[PDB]
Amino acid sequence: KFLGTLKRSKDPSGLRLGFYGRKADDFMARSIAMQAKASAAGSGVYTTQCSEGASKGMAENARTASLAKQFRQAQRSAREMSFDYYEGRKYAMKAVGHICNYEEKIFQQYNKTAAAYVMGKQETLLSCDRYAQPANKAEEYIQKSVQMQMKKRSIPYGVYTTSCADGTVKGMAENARVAKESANFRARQMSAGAKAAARFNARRVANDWHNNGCNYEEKLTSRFPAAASSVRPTTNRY
Amino acid sequence: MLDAFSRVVVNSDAKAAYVGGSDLQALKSFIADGNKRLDAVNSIVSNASCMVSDAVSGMICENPGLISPGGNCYTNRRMAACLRDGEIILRYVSYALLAGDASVLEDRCLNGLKETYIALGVPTNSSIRAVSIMKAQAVAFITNTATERKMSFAAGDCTSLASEVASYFDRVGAAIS
Amino acid sequence: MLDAFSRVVVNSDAKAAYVGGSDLQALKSFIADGNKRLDAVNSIVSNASCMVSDAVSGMICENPGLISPGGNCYTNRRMAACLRDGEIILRYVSYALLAGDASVLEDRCLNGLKETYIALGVPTNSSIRAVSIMKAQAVAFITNTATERKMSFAAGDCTSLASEVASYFDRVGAAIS
Amino acid sequence: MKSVITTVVSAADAAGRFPSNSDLESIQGNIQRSAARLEAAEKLAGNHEAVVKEAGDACFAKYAYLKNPGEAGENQEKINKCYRDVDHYMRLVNYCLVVGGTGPLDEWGIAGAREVYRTLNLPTSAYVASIAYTRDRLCVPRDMSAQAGVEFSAYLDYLINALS
Amino acid sequence: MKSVITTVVSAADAAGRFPSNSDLESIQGNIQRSAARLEAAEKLAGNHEAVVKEAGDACFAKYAYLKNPGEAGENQEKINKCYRDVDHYMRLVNYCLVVGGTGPLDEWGIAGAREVYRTLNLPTSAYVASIAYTRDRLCVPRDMSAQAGVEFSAYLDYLINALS
Amino acid sequence: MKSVITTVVSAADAAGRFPSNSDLESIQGNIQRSAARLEAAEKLAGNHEAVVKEAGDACFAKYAYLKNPGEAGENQEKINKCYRDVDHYMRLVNYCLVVGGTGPLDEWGIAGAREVYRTLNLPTSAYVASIAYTRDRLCVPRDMSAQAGVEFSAYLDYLINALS
Amino acid sequence: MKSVITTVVSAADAAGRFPSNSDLESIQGNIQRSAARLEAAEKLAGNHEAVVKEAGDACFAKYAYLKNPGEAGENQEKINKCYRDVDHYMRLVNYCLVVGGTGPLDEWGIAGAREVYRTLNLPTSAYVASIAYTRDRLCVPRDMSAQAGVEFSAYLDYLINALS
Numbered sequence A: 001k002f003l004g005t006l007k008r009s010k011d012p013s014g015l016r017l018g019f020y021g022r023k024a025d026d027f028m029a030r031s032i033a034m035q036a037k038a039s040a041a042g043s044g045v046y047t048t049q050c051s052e053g054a055s056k057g058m059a060e061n062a063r064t065a066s067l068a069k070q071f072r073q074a075q076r077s078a079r080e081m082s083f084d085y086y087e088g089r090k091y092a093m094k095a096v097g098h099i100c101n102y103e104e105k106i107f108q109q110y111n112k113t114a115a116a117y118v119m120g121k122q123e124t125l126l127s128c129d130r131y132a133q134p135a136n137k138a139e140e141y142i143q144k145s146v147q148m149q150m151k152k153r154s155i156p157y158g159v160y161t162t163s164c165a166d167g168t169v170k171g172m173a174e175n176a177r178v179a180k181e182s183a184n185f186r187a188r189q190m191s192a193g194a195k196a197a198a199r200f201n202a203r204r205v206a207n208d209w210h211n212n213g214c215n216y217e218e219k220l221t222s223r224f225p226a227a228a229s230s231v232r233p234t235t236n237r238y
Numbered sequence B, C: 001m002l003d004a005f006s007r008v009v010v011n012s013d014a015k016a017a018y019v020g021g022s023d024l025q026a027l028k029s030f031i032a033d034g035n036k037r038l039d040a041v042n043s044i045v046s047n048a049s050c051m052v053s054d055a056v057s058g059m060i061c062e063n064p065g066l067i068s069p070g071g072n073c074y075t076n077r078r079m080a081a082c083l084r085d086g087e088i089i090l091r092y093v094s095y096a097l098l099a100g101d102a103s104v105l106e107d108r109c110l111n112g113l114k115e116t117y118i119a120l121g122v123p124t125n126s127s128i129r130a131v132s133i134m135k136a137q138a139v140a141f142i143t144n145t146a147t148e149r150k151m152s153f154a155a156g157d158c159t160s161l162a163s164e165v166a167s168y169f170d171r172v173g174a175a176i177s
Numbered sequence D, E, F, G: 001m002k003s004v005i006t007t008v009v010s011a012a013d014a015a016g017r018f019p020s021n022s023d024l025e026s027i028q029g030n031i032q033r034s035a036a037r038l039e040a041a042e043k044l045a046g047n048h049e050a051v052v053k054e055a056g057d058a059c060f061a062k063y064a065y066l067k068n069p070g071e072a073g074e075n076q077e078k079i080n081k082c083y084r085d086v087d088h089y090m091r092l093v094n095y096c097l098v099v100g101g102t103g104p105l106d107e108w109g110i111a112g113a114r115e116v117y118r119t120l121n122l123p124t125s126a127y128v129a130s131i132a133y134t135r136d137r138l139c140v141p142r143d144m145s146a147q148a149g150v151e152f153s154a155y156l157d158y159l160i161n162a163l164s
Ligand SMILES: *[C@@H](C)[C@H]1/C(=C/C2=NC(=C\c3[nH]c(C[C@H]4NC(=O)C(/C=C/[C@H](Cc5c(/C=C6N=C(/C=C7\NC(=O)[C@H](C)[C@H]7CC)C(C)=C\6CCC(=O)O)[nH]c(C[C@H]6NC(=O)C(C=C)=C6C)c5C)C(=O)O)=C4C)c(C)c3CCC(=O)O)/C(CCC(=O)O)=C2C)NC(=O)[C@@H]1C
Pocket: A027, A028, A030, A031, A032, A034, A035, A096, A098, A099, A100, A101, A102, A103, A106
């Protein structure tokens, strides 16, 4: 029984919910970033916080390092888009805290909204390794060895698997290189009232989302909170 | 991800069969022309800065309807993507001549290309006309029938690799459509 | 990051100099000993899983004070970390025999390592005592002076290679004390 | 796959650059070694049913406690399905002996092998000691060449270093 | 550095694994190629000075517009600065033929070439005019050997292909 | 579109708040400035080919190396290819004077501009070698005055800084 | 702050770029504004305590429920403390009037207005009536011009809508 419209092994992505749901997925994803950028330039001033380029040739190619990354995370195979659809229902449900029923049914249906609330709240709370900084050499080498085991997701077998390709054209890597060392100089101080909005919620990202137990590494964020937000255990495969 | 060595393996995996002695004596045919495979990659990668500029100026003189305003390579920004789109198509097909298998192309660029070009409006007829220059440049470069530079090596067979790079350049059109 | 080959080109640009013929005899010493050294890097990695199964068990049959209640390697939340702090060492010494220069050890793990350990409360007197065993594992594995392990290669000496593996096991000892 | 082709063209993919003389020095080692290093791959698949017959029993020759009640090999189909798992670790070695790498052994053998064995009450030392017995079975006459057995002794020891 | 023995000792870093039995086939293939390429690197170390001036005329024999005021080749200090960077650009591929690949050029030469020749207005078409005139002086007599000029004319047109 | 209109209301759009009283003086900034920034456009709305002809191969006058076999301007539709890019430039600065700022060059002329003549091996200073031939031609006799000669040198000096 | 200068120098900071002509056009209308707008900066200095005294007691007249127990005005120190907050308010609505933008209303007036009156049990409805005896007083009879009166209530009940 066949010869109609049903395939025997086609290539979906899973996650599909019809044609009338991806418009409601992407518009409510864009409403998350409408509310997430209400705290960077929410006063009415683009701060020292955004900084889309450093020089003349560093602005307009930071767009092409953002929609090629939209295309690099669109040609994923049938496992790894089945993977994070079930992981957006786990990780981003640990972002609201109060399990409320209205934003229960939305976040476990609309996975682009689920992959933007966990990414929006990690830039409102300045808790990436683009905003963090050490003070000790003991704080230093613990922080960069969690970043060394964060590359085990990208190369898990001895091949790089193209999801940290960081550049398509023959000089895009060294334009992607100097923007990183400028962004730790752009997020070098951020305020005088910063390094406590960049430090105290760094002990409110790890210890309540991921490690519900394991009181030794809960007590190491109290020692060194630089590795507490450079951990990135949200599975973005990077 | 996958090669000509690992195409005999993944085919024999499906029959649950060991790799024997006569299935893989065609695998040392790949080693008998092995320095032919490596004398013919340097002709393509050392001319690959001319070859993207020969192709993106090549296709526009036959259809100058999309450098017109309202076209699809009109703007200098719109042309800058075309020097970034077609630069990596010859970068990915330089891997498949080395790898011996046309599945480097299938999963780094070809997946997701065909539903972006219906969203970014790219015409399909003009795109394969750009790739059809490059299959003629590649057969002109890996033997010594080129325009100006002759990569003079110790000569012999060259056409068994020339149909192979014709068999890797055609399938860009297979998913551009 | 760096190797034996690019070490001499930084010594070129102390003065912006070149590498000629008699500037190449330091690198002719490495291109001649090429089948010795590749037969001394697989000798390490074939049994490094037992080299960590000997060393930290040799740490306790020399001083069993770390399995004391209140010790540093008491529970398996602390024992499995000790089977990781030694395990990444034998990766990094094995590249230094490959690269011909201790570089990758100094870049990745032994900058601030003793400043890291004393904030973890790590007793450093057991630390050198664990890897001084590892200095003698490698000189008795690239030579065939093991008890039952006999990975017998072809004839010829590897005692100047035994001189240089202890030149990649000394720099860890000046970095954890 | 972790062939010698794939680790030098994916590193160029992660910079977005063309193949170089770096990458072409890799392939000359896959010309030079493959006139010795894949020449045992005929003779692992010439006889394998005469070779894993010496690897299937040698588990039970030194682990006779498995053929007991209340353990793994209770009836004879757990003595007969127990032999294809040691046959499947020999098809993965001559797959690895031709591709130039530990590609299929890492991704089909040791991928997820921590969890299926401990759940089914199956010890990993029954797997390891049965085919570490097939590492004292090597010489230059009637086996492969002297610089071809070390290309075969490293792939058995890749299993033993990773199942441990 | 982007050498092949520097690449695969960083590919085994990021997964946390040993040097496997694929990456050390490439290190044998370096010795297959360094038997016929560093024997072509003492020859350009034999002439640091004869092969900069013929490239130094090849940027001036066709570009006679530099001696106009307000341009690159103003006076003789601006034409002896013209020589010393192709003295650098043959010092740079001196290092490439003794290390193993495109190591120092991606670090020191081409990184920042997009904005040292746009802000200082140095004409980059005269840079590739000099080194291509060095490229066709290779011959079957009179030079390095027939498998030694493959690698000299591999990084020479690579630096042409970067700036193009 | 970078202007005094869209950017002062995208400043209200970033915060997620109302249109504010800081916006209303910046649009008063182009209530008053459109007696000269709207009165420099029409001097080149009736002068299109008279500008680009004598200025266009004034580039070719000062550069006697763009005509050779193996070079750019060999034949005349490629000279018209050189000419039509200068036809696009003062076309685009007509749109800059009538929106509010450098916006219609910031998307349509200068975005992604610096590499696409470099891959086309064109001298990017040779575009600048005719706009500075055109920048000095502002004059309070024969044209609009020097308070409107600051808005034809508000957009022809940003174009020579874009290729710098 | 959030001034008209500190908006247009932030948007050019938002990409890391030069201040172009649209940023220079964005303060040219302050020449057409601060010859008239800054004339309203004196009328609240001439009435420091004259206009806050007759407006604030009428808030006590139409909201006469602050004489009950549990309210603010149960004694004499909350009589003065209602008044001096408006002495901070009418300084800061003058402080946006002397800088142009919306800075000192948002840097020191409203950023945290949701929390400082609910735990303190002070009504935000009384702050609507605090300016509703001042918004209905802008008469160009017996005062100065409506050229400095297009913005003044448009700051003042915009302060209400910030607290609303
Ligand atoms: C669980 C809920 C507990 C809880 C937690 C707390 N969260 C806090 C702050 C906070 N939450 C979020 C997460 C938000 N992001 C998000 O997407 C979302 C849910 C989504 C909707 C979808 C949506 C709508 C929906 C309706 N619009 C309606 C209006 C009308 N309908 C009519 O008929 C007319 C026209 C009009 C009525 C006059 C309506 C009735 C809707 C349905 C609601 C319903 O059925 O329940 N509309 C639109 C379109 C526009 N709205 C909009 O917001 C945007 C732009 C994005 C547009 C174009 C959309 C998209 C939605 O997105 O709004 C939620 C909740 C975030 C990001 C924050 C931080 C910012 C903030 O402060 O809000 C807080 C406060 C503390 C803090 O940290 O700030 C808490 C305590 N709250 C609880 O009480 C629960 C225990």
